[PDB]
Write a protein that binds this DNA or RNA. Sequence first.
DNA 1: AATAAGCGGAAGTGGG
DNA 2: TCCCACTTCCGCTTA
Length: 91
Amino acid sequence: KIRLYQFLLDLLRSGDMKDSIWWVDKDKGTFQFSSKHKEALAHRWGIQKGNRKKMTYQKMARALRNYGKTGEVKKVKKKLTYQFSGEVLGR
DNA sequence: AATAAGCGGAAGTGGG
DNA sequence: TCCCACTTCCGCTTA
Ligand code: NA
């Protein structure tokens, strides 16, 4: 089953939900969610995973926060903005 | 107030 | 047994 950071990286590469997520500085791996359109992306994540409940942005961000300690994704001090690690980007 | 972003402890679910 | 990789729930804090 795909991991959340990989789902997000794949979306950014495909551009399939450009109104929900975008690169800020792709060389640094920083990206940002849409305030108004992030829920549609969260819904897609839950459906891809086959979860029992509807996925929300709040629950998806709860999962994202767990990557802070291992480093795959870190929160940036800007609204709705995060940063992939170099290791994640290189793979 | 209304709305929104951000946080994380705790317990539950999946698939090894 | 016991960790993976989240998911779900709940209460709190700041803007
Ligand atoms: Na929000």
